[PDB]
Ligand binder design. Structure first.
Ligand code: HEC
Ligand code: HEC
Lengths: 125, 125
């Protein structure tokens, strides 16, 4: 869906920006600094679900650019493992949110954040 | 969820960028220049559904900035009517996609695009 590589870069950056707002805006809730409304969080995690599936298709072959370390395309199976592990940790966060189980939410949130950081460490310039 | 107004600007711009990729990538399909796969389009419109609900919350009071004409906050009911009409045209596009009805897709797509342009004309700098 991208006319030039720059379009893929702009798309993924925008997806990651959201996806990151929808994750990070829950930090006060997970820390207890903001109240926990199970329905609010269930709805927000559903948005995060959808967003978390979007960036990866915008790292097609030859869409090198942005802050994407070059190691992303030449090690394709390994980058895919990281996105799919991230994506699997998001399933666990959805399960916690859907259940209204705060303790499960906090644990799952930490796992998700570790998965963000793991990819950032291997693949962000 | 925004620490400063600039954060809201960055969020809405990113949401609008996606939302706009998910809309515009269907143009070749609506024109018949690309094949029509009903399931593909149903799934893409579902993504567009979700995205099309996101920008509006990032135009809170005092988040002036970006390419958002100042007329957005002082005429709040009217800006809300435009986003909700856009949002209603998206419901019609979902219905067309869900039904696998190509003719209904083309008509709904044109209505959506007109709603994008109408808001762009009243509120984009
Ligand atoms: C888990 C919820 C997160 C969060 C909060 C973020 N990421 Fe990543 N990310 C990855 C790569 C390769 C990039 C660079 C993209 C490019 O510039 O081409 C990024 C970038 C970001 C950003 C900045 C986006 C921007 O506006 O420029 C942010 C805010 C961000 N990330 C947060 C790679 C990955 C992953 C590889 C599988 C995973 C998982 C994540 N990121 C997860 C997260
Ligand atoms: C219907 C599907 C669309 C499409 C394809 C786009 N919009 Fe809009 N849009 C609106 C405003 C106020 C702005 C400025 C935001 C800001 O800068 O603060 C925009 C911006 C955009 C962009 C550019 C985003 C960026 O990266 O800077 C794009 C690509 C875009 N729009 C496309 C306002 C509205 C609406 C008011 C209710 C509606 C409806 C739409 N836009 C709809 C669409």
């Amino acid at each position: 869906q991208f006319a030039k590589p720059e379009d893929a870069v702009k798309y993924r950056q925008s997806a990651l920006t959201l996806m990151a707002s929808h994750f990070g805006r829950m930090t006060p809730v997970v820390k207890g600094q903001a109240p926990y409304d199970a329905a609010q969080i269930k709805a927000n995690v559903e948005v995060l679900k959808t967003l978390s599936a979007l960036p990866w298709a915008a790292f097609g072959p030859g869409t090198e650019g942005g802050d994407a370390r070059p190691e992303i395309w030449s090690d394709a199976a390994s980058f895919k493992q990281k996105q799919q592990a991230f994506q699997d940790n998001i399933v666990k966060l959805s399960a916690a949110a859907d259940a209204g189980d705060l303790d499960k939410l906090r644990a799952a949130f930490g796992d998700v954040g570790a998965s963000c950081k793991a990819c950032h460490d291997a693949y962000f310039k």
